[model samples]
Target: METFAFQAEIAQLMSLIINTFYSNKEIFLRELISNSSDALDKIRYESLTDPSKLDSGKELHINLIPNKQDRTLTIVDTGIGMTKADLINNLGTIAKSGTKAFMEALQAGADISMIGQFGVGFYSAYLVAEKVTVITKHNDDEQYAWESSAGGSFTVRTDTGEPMGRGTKVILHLKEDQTEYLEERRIKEIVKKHSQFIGYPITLFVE
Candidate 1:
């Protein structure tokens, strides 16, 4: 098992997002789905250039699995899963602009713009969960798990939990107060409200 610390900026970024968007908790689902769509788009684009990039067994789609027993909601995507370094770099820090620019944009009335520009859409997961665990399998790398409990640090460990094939699966351990996310009704409404028009087929496994 390998352990890593969230960079100073990343810790602050998580705090900023949790505080800034606390009231809009449902939007986390939308942002996550958007990120999955992005992953799907990326793989589709990259596979065109790389002959062996496609995952022959999996179809491109977004799968939302809610588990009431565990109070966990999982978002699974058949996309370009992250390698070890990609997970740390992509989720560990924002490379677009510093928080100062983000603050300026926030003050300038750009609430959602930074997600796309700064690639921080993934951090929105902290809004509803106490912990987020990402299990991923890249086309050319071993599967790995990246987990953080909104703490200043996170850990990356070998993923032997399931044979995930070539994709990414994010499991959110719902905060006590955010248990409503375990409800299928709520998830369906959120999908309809924001991501109904997403190109990829989104499937929510009702529990």
Candidate 2:
């Protein structure tokens, strides 16, 4: 396993997000789904010019699996997965040079694309999940799992689970106070409220 510490600025930003964003907790689902859709769009666009970049057999879609017994919610997408380096760069530090630029863009009414550009959407998962596990398989790299508890550090390792073919899956271990995310009805409402017009299909499975 490879471990890395979050940058000081990132750690402080995370703490602020966790403490001050309780009222907007439901946006976590929307942000994650938006990220997935963006991933799908990226691969789709790449495949249009180079068909080998993605598997033609796989239809693009997002799958939501909520397991009450495990207190986990898994979000899977047949999108462009990340490589080892990509994982570290995307997860270990703030995506931009400084948080100040990001905040300025946000306050300047930046478009939705800024969320992915700034890499803040993924961290939003911590609002409802104590631990988050990401399993991803890139076309050019082996499958790997990146995990963290939204703390100061994160770990990455080669994943031995069944190959995901070409996609990413994020499993969120819900926090004790966030059990409502495991309910199918609750998830459905959140999806409708935020991502009803997403380009790809979203399937929810609860157990």
Candidate 3:
């Protein structure tokens, strides 16, 4: 197994992504779905060279399933799944300077409304999820599952279930206050506001 070193400021970077970008908390679904769409676009483009990598027959799509009984919600896509290394790096690293400055500003009590303008929106999932699990199957690598409470660290392991073919699944174990996100109406409203113009199919499950 290959191991990568964390940058000197990885802890601070994680704080920026989790704390600063997700200040509003309610927008976590929007941010995560947006990131999913981006990954879909990327994998679709990469498929031009290798068609066997595709999970879905058509372009790309996003599906949201809310489980009222379990108090969990799942956002699934047939996009590019990450390898184990990616799970570590993505959930554990941060890039860009604007995010750095935003975290600093937040420390000084700066307004959060202006903070997201600098492109730190993806980490919003931490706002609502007491626990977040990602099950991914990359076209180029073996399937893997990752879990985290968004605390000091996350865990990654191989999946025993069949691979997803290709794509990423983000499962959110919601916090009590953010349970409103389980409603299709609520999810659609936020998705429409932030991602209607985005280039992919987004669907929500009400029941």
Report the lDDT tens digits of candidate 1 across residue range 57-109: 44889999999889899999998888988877754445335554665677788
Best-performing candidate as measured by lDDT: 2
Model 3 segments more than 4 A misplaced? 1-23, 55-59, 95-101, 105-120
Candidate number with the higher TM-score (2 or 3):
2
**TM-score of every model?**
0.90, 0.88, 0.79
Evaluated against the true structure, the overall lDDT of model 2 is 0.82
Clashes of 3: 0
Query: What lDDT would candidate 3 get against the real structure?
Result: 0.71
CA displacement after TM-score superposition, residue 12 of candidate 1 (Å): 1.0
Q: Which ten residues in a row have the lowest lDDT in candidate 1?
A: 91-100
Error of 2 at 179 (Å): 0.8
Q: Model 2 segments beyond 4 Å from truth? A: 90-98, 102-117
For candidate 1, give the lDDT of residue 160.
88
Candidate 3 TM-score over all chains jointly: 0.79
lDDT of each: 0.81, 0.82, 0.71
Clashes in model 3: which pairs?
none
